[PDB]
Write an enzyme that holds these catalytic residues in place. Structure first.
Site: not given
Length: 367
Positions: A26, A43, A139
């Site tokens: 990505g 993105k 994350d």
């Protein structure tokens, strides 16, 4: 593949200006929304069938978050999602600087607790809304906490990168998940995990902001669980028993008076995998209370020092509750907002300290 100079949207129109970043999968690129004065981040996701399921679930989470369009809980506002060429991309708002780049330009100098407090309150509010929706970020790292505007809106942050986000499920992570330095012990040991793996990541970053360097900068998962156990004690026996990866870092020692589990020594691990383990911590702690006794040379006089010592007393109190190995007993985002470090109820016991007047001041400005 990679593209540049021009872009096309189905409903809007964007012209790519400069590249922004490249991860494992990505690509994000800064572009200009034609017809306006807005700069947005797009993105792109490669159209490979093996990555199509992860690309689709990320869009599903953003649409469920976009219903919370106010985003007073400090999320990056996702505008739209279109498909260019054969790839599917996402449009986000353009933030300024992430927390890692803020520490890099300042030579990784420690930040005062009065600046750490607003950032902690905003991120905990985000994780309070994520648990309200039954979602995990998976994350949470300084690279994924960006400042909106460091000069116009001082110390206002939002969270990015939902490429690892997922709904809560009773499934053990097959291999690895979060970033290593901020990975909860559940992912390291192979245990069922929920939203608590972000409370662990939030503990490792507020400790990183206070020390300047990562709290547990292990190069391998063995070094990671070694620093944690050497600083906070070995994980519980019941946790190491049902841990799938638990046998890769610990062993079943059985002396005449020994218990059940113990760590593999640096000599034993070096012989098992062939990799010599070196130290990478800038701060070695026999206990999380030693964090309060780190970087203790300030200009604060007796009136202000009595509060800074009380500020650190509650910082390690919250940090210990955020870094509990047992995820069942780990503090929840709702309780973190009620911790005395965020309530500042311990600073009210000081009549007039010129430092605590600034501590309360930095908080009510973050709005």
């Amino acid at each position: 593949l990679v593209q540049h100079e021009v872009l096309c949207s189905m409903k809007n129109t964007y012209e790519v200006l400069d590249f922004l970043g490249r991860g494992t999968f990505g690509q994000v690129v800064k572009c200009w929304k034609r017809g306006t004065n807005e700069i947005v981040a797009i993105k792109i996701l490669k159209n490979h069938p093996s990555y199509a399921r992860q690309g689709q679930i990320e869009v599903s989470i953003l649409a469920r978050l976009s219903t919370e369009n106010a985003d007073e809980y400090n999320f990056v506002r996702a505008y739209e999602c279109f498909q260019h060429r054969n790839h599917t991309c996402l449009v986000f708002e353009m933030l300024e600087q992430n927390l890692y780049d803020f520490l890099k330009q300042n030579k990784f100098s420690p930040l005062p607790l009065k600046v750490i407090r607003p950032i902690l309150q905003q991120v905990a509010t985000a994780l309070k809304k994520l648990k309200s929706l039954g979602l995990i970020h998976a994350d949470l790292k300084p690279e994924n906490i960006m400042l909106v505007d460091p000069v116009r809106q001082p110390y206002r942050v939002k969270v990015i990168d939902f490429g690892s986000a997922s709904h809560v499920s009773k499934t053990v992570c097959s291999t690895y998940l979060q970033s290593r330095y901020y990975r909860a012990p559940e992912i390291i040991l192979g245990l069922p995990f929920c939203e608590a793996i972000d409370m662990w990541s939030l503990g490792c970053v507020i400790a990183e902001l206070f020390l300047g360097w990562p709290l547990y900068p292990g190069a391998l998962e063995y070094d990671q669980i070694r620093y944690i156990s050497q600083t906070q004690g070995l994980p519980g026996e019941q946790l190491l028993n049902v841990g799938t990866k638990s046998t890769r870092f610990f062993c079943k020692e059985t002396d005449m008076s020994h218990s059940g589990w113990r760590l593999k020594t640096l000599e034993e691990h070096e012989a098992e995998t062939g990799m010599k383990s070196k130290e990478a911590r800038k701060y070695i702690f026999n206990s999380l209370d030693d964090v309060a006794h780190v970087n203790t040379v300030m200009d604060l006089e007796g009136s202000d020092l009595l509060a800074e010592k009380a500020d650190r007393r509650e910082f390690v109190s919250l940090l210990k509750k955020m870094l509990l190995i047992d995820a069942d007993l780990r503090i929840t985002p709702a309780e973190t907002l009620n911790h005395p470090f965020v309530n500042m109820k311990h600073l009210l016991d000081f009549p007039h300290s010129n430092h605590v007047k600034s501590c309360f001041h930095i908080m009510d400005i973050c709005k």
